Design a protein around this ligand. Structure first.
Ligand SMILES: Cc1cc2nc3c(=O)[nH]c(=O)nc-3n(C[C@H](O)[C@H](O)[C@H](O)COP(=O)(O)O)c2cc1C
Ligand SMILES: O=Cc1ccc(O)cc1
Ligand SMILES: O=Cc1ccc(O)cc1
Length: 362
């Protein structure tokens, strides 16, 4: 029935139109050279501004934080200006937008990071994990990362902190820390991906240290009311696996709650990796974290409404459906049929498969 889904909600200093979120979705359409957010991306996001909140596709915080060809960066003056075009376009439509600050850690190839060697919590390679390269050739197997030294850690935190400032300069309403889907921070969090012997490995407290320090920096830079964090407790598609996900992530949620981050975003499904997410686990997260809770992963109107009314979620993200339906909210509200996206145009290319999905017309 969707009544709650269409109720507004306060997100820090923002008052959002509804509970629908356009989750972060890499489309790899950044202008070359320079990986700059561009005009077609601005049109793309503005077309979907009826969402209550838009979270931008992952945007790398540095040259070595990139994992896929043509993804937009947020560290150069040009990239900031490029993103500004996007946020202004989105704001002109009346919608809030957060920048997803990204660092892929070991999920990359030297070709995508100026020949450099990928960094990670440890020297563990992601099993059968491929990334894309060039400016095109194709997919290639990820490389072997090198364990991050204390200097590396201080640098990445620095890059995250500056990226946050750059996001504000770019006009974003806030930032989302990508600590999910097997990327850098996730590589510290999950036990089976972190084999460090120092303060950033071993115990649960140590495995959460990097997340704690990065968030501390982000909050210090732009305020907790403008900081969101994304986690992926149960999925493992990109190579990260935890030994006790339920405990690790309930703890992570409690930790983030202390930082008073504005929202916690849970990535429940990653492609066809949809692990059963116990309602009991969801209720524990609801108690561990008291802010705005967002979930994304195979939701339809019914399941979204039910998640909100059961007290499990405050907002719900719809990813793939938003790709093919710029007016997704209107369709969900009326029960109009949803167009399906074309996998072949998800990444790279131009406007085709990006801005030419029409709004609904009976
Ligand atoms: C083309 C595509 C690119 C994605 N890129 C991102 C991203 O950059 N960052 C992220 O955290 N999740 C990313 N996601 C995951 C989505 O945000 C979302 O959690 C996922 O698609 C599950 O929701 P859905 O079943 O409604 O599509 C991507 C998904 C797709 C389909
Ligand atoms: O096919 C191109 C491509 C670019 C970046 C990716 O993330 C995935 C695919
Ligand atoms: O398909 C690209 C992709 C990028 C980042 C993720 O978090 C998940 C998917």
């Amino acid at each position: 029935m969707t009544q709650s889904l269409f109720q507004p909600i306060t997100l820090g200093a923002l008052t959002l139109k509804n509970r629908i979120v356009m989750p972060p979705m890499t489309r790899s359409r950044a202008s070359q050279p320079g990986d700059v957010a561009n005009h077609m991306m601005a049109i793309y996001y503005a077309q979907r501004a009826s969402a209550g909140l838009i979270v931008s596709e992952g945007t790398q915080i540095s040259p070595t934080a990139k994992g896929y060809a043509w993804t937009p960066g947020i560290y150069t003056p040009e990239q900031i200006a490029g993103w500004r075009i996007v946020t202004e376009a989105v704001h002109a439509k009346g919608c809030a937008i957060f920048a997803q600050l990204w660092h892929v850690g070991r999920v990359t190839h030297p070709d995508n990071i100026d020949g450099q060697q990928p960094i990670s919590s440890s020297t563990l390679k992601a099993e059968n994990v491929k990334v894309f390269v060039d400016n095109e050739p194709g997919f290639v197997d990820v490389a072997v990362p090198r364990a991050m030294t204390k200097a590396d850690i201080a640098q990445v935190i620095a890059d995250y902190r500056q990226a946050a400032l750059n996001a504000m300069e770019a006009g974003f309403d806030g930032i989302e820390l990508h600590a999910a889907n097997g990327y850098l921070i996730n590589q510290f969090i999950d036990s089976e991906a972190n084999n460090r012997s120092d303060e950033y490995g071993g115990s649960l407290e140590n495995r959460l240290r990097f997340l704690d320090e990065v968030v501390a920096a982000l909050v210090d830079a732009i305020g907790a009311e403008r900081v969101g964090v994304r986690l992926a407790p149960l999925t493992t598609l990109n190579g990260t696996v935890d030994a006790d996900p339920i405990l690790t992530y309930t703890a992570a949620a409690a930790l983030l709650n202390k930082h008073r981050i504005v929202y916690l975003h849970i990535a429940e499904v990653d492609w066809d990796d949809a692990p059963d997410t116990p309602v009991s686990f969801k209720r524990a997260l609801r108690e561990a974290y008291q802010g705005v809770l967002i979930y994304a992963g195979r939701y339809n109107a019914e399941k979204a409404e039910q998640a909100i009314n059961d007290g499990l979620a405050d907002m719900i993200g719809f990813g793939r459906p938003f790709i093919a339906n710029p007016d997704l909210p209107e369709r969900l509200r009326h029960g109009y049929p949803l167009a399906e996206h074309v996998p072949a145009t998800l990444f790279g290319g131009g406007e085709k498969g990006l801005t030419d999905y029409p709004t609904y017309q009976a």
